[PDB]
Amino acid sequence: AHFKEYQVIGRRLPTESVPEPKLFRMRIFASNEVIAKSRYWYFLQKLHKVKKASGEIVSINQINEAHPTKVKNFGVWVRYDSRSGTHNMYKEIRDVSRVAAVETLYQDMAARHRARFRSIHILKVAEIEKTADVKRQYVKQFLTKDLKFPLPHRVQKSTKTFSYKRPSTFY
Template identity: 65%
Template sequence: MGRFTEYSVIGRTLPTENTPEPKLYRMRIFAPNEVVAKSRYWYYLRQLKKAKKANGEIVAINVIHEKKPLKVKNFAIWLRYDSRSGTHNMVKEFRALSRAEAVEAMYQDMAARHRARFRNVQILRVAEIEKKEDIRRPYIKQLLEPGLKFPLPHRRTKSKAWYAANRPVSGFHPIHSSHDYMLPGLKLVYPISNKMMNVLYWVNGLIKAVD
């Protein structure tokens, strides 16, 4: 799946004579687009409230944006997934900028470690861990140490350049290429290459010869 977005989906069953005003059910769904978000909404609602898409409707679907997208936060995700041998519950911790990025990292981790597909993972709860003492995973704790430093294992040093990369100019040019170059009715204020400068000198000589 692609990058995930957090959606707030609100739906209900269709009104009937017995229930003219049915209840509204809201869910926070993580999905790559609105189509998948609606599909997952009806998947959960069918299991929880015995409501089908054929007998229901989506009232509203909105995108939930992160309040502080530039702050790195620690998240805990409670999930349930179906493996080849059974159903398992687990809690995972991630460090990300938003809830959607943490969920995306969770799906990547589940696919790598447990071969879990997107359809086999059910997110139960996503919460931000505000206190440092509440973090339990060592791979998250090691990133919270003060004065944290990272090694530079592959540093490629460059030797001093003994030869010039540009073609040398043997002639004397009183006007530097980065300065202004004056021609009758023309003023250049941007850098000029040596080849272009020679052309301008040649044109200037022709103009003087004609005059």
Template identity: 60%
Template sequence: MSLQLREYKVVGRCLPTPKCTTPPLYRMRIFAPNHVVAKSRFWYFVSQLKKMKKSSGEIVYCGQVYEKSPLRVKNFGIWLRYDSRSGTHNMYREYRDLTTAGAVTQCYRDMGARHRARAHSIQIMKVEEIAASKCRRPAVKQFHVSEPTLQWLLDEGISPEWYRFALQPKKGQEPNLGACVHDYGI
């Protein structure tokens, strides 16, 4: 998944039959790069939950959901399930982002980096905007103070002086080739 994910609302149902003329509608919140993948994921999830598949059903509505306030930074809690090499795991993660879709995209990237979880093996169960007081993870909580510090540097034992030195632009130097010169005594 190289694209930013988008949030879609997909509504589908079984095709009407003589036995059931008005089948119930099923609505899902799907995160996908485009509407084609969103519909495909809808059928994947709905076939697991209900006795329904694409050949015997129809999509009633598929539309993109837009963020109400995309200029305000929010905290998001994401509940997910993923399949690893050893089994299925449930997980709760927190992210800070402007949009829900941005937080879910961060989650997919993070799961791939930290747990080697592929996108197809991750199932997002619930995404919720959470208040600063309800946040649990230190990576998110460090931004809730009035003067944020890079606390992880201090926790790692890295002094702020060293960090300032590391960020300073380096002056150009000639490469030291002394170790590469060989004297064979010929």
């Protein structure tokens, strides 16, 4: 579904004579808090040898976008498993918000790579601030000055049975 950002902190349990461990913080994109916590443990075990019984979650939080009006540009690091071998991948995404970019990224990774939501491990999403750091050509296609183009798919849903008009993609 439509995901959400989550500040998730874990601190694996202060034992006897070990007070206050190091409060490991991550940021998870998930549809709810529950799968966010599950993914947080799923990364924390890959960080080092914890279990969900070994530690605990400090604070689950949703964090919104500060400026969800501006179209930002993003460079994303992803790791995932082409089942036998892993490899990283760096993608550049023009999007208004972060979590919608991560949504579209999951859709694209499932489109081109047949990879599930569990197989995809987000490394980093960060805004590309200035122009020309867009290494990808296709996002750079929309960085031109005074960009104009016509609509493709003038075909629409006609919603009726018979048409008297002999219609036309008149665009």
